[PDB]
């Protein structure tokens, strides 16, 4: 857990969004998410998990987290989940794929879920 | 049944959509797609590929195809791709994941692409 240390802090995606995360010694991720796009305003609760006893020969550290897009300012009736890996070093990255599901009628269920890709770095 | 024989014909998904496909001896898939949902009317040109020499160990047969949702009747400015495998036998299936991308502005890029799951059978649901 250069991993706990490496993951903890602020990350920015390609779109301008800001993730503030704390990694726990036993696999917890907790923090907040502020989105630069979509039906979003202010910050949202983040929760997830990461491999807290990670591999150690060049391989990344698997993780994931969820944000439900409801806070005191807005409710988009959607929740996004990011799955990917933390890669450390002078050019640290969290490379993720993200699924965003919206609540829909049965009829609209085939259009419930978006897929995208987010790359997070430590600098703006 | 070889994959070529097994894949060729008509398949139906959970939503009522209709796939009519011919598998070529060297990996080609050609046919049409008729959608029971969305901005769709009539049939749409299907093209894809499949593994024409699949593993004989009880594995499914990898395949994939694309339909751009434009025809003589409508243009949804979208295209869908299905990736999955054909499983033969008395309860044959084509089990797929499907991406549907719409043309968007740069600003709306993050919501261009839907993901879903389609399960196709030889008999109507």
Task: Outline the fold blueprint.
Two copies of one chain form a homodimer.
Chain A: H1 2-7, E1 9-13, E2 18-23, E3 28-34, E4 44-50, E5 61-70, E6 75-87, E7 93-102, E8 113-121
Antiparallel strand pairs in A: 1-2, 1-8, 2-3, 3-4, 4-5, 5-6, 6-7, 7-8
Structure description:
Two copies of one chain form a homodimer. The first copy, chain A, is mainly beta and 124 residues long. The first copy, chain A, has one domain: Beta Barrel (Lipocalin). Chain A has one helix and eight strands, in the order αββββββββ. Chain A is globular and about 50 Å long. Chain A: It is found in: Secreted.
Helical content band of chain A: under 10%
Oligomer: homodimer
Give the ordered list of helices and strands of chain A: HEEEEEEEE
Q: Which pair of protein chains has the largest interface, and what are the residue counts?
A: A-B, 13 and 13 residues
Q: Give the termini distance of chain A in whole angstroms.
A: 24 Å
CATH H level of chain A: which superfamily? Avidin-like
CATH architecture of chain A: Beta Barrel
Work out the strand percent of chain A. Answer: over 45%
Q: Compute the gyration radius of chain A: what is it?
A: 15 Å
Number of domains as seen in the coordinates of chain A: 1
Subcellular location (chain A): Secreted
Family (chain A): Belongs to the avidin/streptavidin family.
Protein name (chain A): Streptavidin
GO molecular function (chain A): biotin binding
């Amino acid at each position: 857990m250069t991993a706990e240390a490496g993951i903890t802090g602020t990350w920015y995606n390609q779109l301008g969004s800001t993730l503030i995360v704390t990694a726990g010694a036993d696999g917890a991720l907790t923090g907040t998410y502020e989105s630069a796009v979509g039906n979003a305003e202010g910050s949202y609760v983040l929760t997830g998990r990461y491999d807290s006893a990670p591999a150690t020969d060049g391989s990344g550290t698997a993780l994931g987290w969820t944000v439900a897009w409801k806070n005191n300012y807005r409710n988009a009736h959607s929740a996004s989940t990011w799955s990917g890996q933390y890669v450390g070093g002078a050019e640290a990255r969290i490379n993720t794929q993200v699924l965003t599901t919206s609540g829909t009628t049965e009829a609209n269920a085939w259009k419930s879920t978006l897929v995208g890709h987010d790359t997070f770095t430590k600098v703006k």
